[PDB]
Design a binder for this molecule. Sequence first.
Ligand SMILES: CO[C@H]1/C=C/O[C@@]2(C)Oc3c(C)c(O)c4c(O)c(c(/C=N/N5CCN(C)CC5)c(O)c4c3C2=O)NC(=O)/C(C)=C\C=C\[C@H](C)[C@H](O)[C@@H](C)[C@@H](O)[C@@H](C)[C@H](OC(C)=O)[C@@H]1C
Ligand SMILES: Nc1[nH]c2ccc(Cl)cc2c(=O)c1-c1ccccc1
Length: 140
Amino acid sequence: NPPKPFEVHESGAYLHGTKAELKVGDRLVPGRESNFEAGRIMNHIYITQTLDAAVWGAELAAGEGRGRIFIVEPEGAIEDDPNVTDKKLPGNPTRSYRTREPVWIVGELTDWVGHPPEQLAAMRQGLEELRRKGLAVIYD
Ligand SMILES: CO[C@H]1/C=C/O[C@@]2(C)Oc3c(C)c(O)c4c(O)c(c(/C=N/N5CCN(C)CC5)c(O)c4c3C2=O)NC(=O)/C(C)=C\C=C\[C@H](C)[C@H](O)[C@@H](C)[C@@H](O)[C@@H](C)[C@H](OC(C)=O)[C@@H]1C
Ligand SMILES: Nc1[nH]c2ccc(Cl)cc2c(=O)c1-c1ccccc1
């Protein structure tokens, strides 16, 4: 399924893109290393209700694996991801959220296609440019 930017599914189910080999049944607590800043300990887990965002999460995750999209259930409260809320577009059209509490892995999505390679390379090259200019501010 070719991700359409800002398109929710009728489930409203929480998604999580990553390269981590997670399994159905896993409970995962906050505090892993950031995908964007070596050595940065995370206060939150990031989740999304759009397929587009979860694909970005699978493609941009650190690791040698192939991207995976997990279906997750938070144990506690979620809030708008500030990294993508009112930062260009008003509100939270990617429907990206974060939580200070653990999440359970309740399934895996298997029939999705990632972004065209020139889109993923453009995203990676833009992020390296914000790195080099010291404009890659990450809120957590
Ligand atoms: C769900 O979000 C995704 C897709 C959105 O879909 C889509 C269609 O809607 C977007 C919204 C609503 C944005 O508000 C946005 C944005 O604010 C932004 C970049 C950056 N794009 N660039 C590429 C080319 N460009 C010329 C330069 C920079 C974006 O592309 C988007 C963007 C999209 O592309 N940020 C910036 O420009 C700056 C100044 C800083 C970035 C800081 C950190 C590093 C990031 O925030 C990290 C923490 C992640 O949060 C993102 C990497 C998101 O990855 C995930 C997995 O979450 C990703 C945006
Ligand atoms: N979406 C994210 N937001 C972040 C915000 C802040 C910090 Cl310190 C880290 C992250 C981060 O690692 C991710 C992520 C990227 C790919 C796969 C899963 C999660």
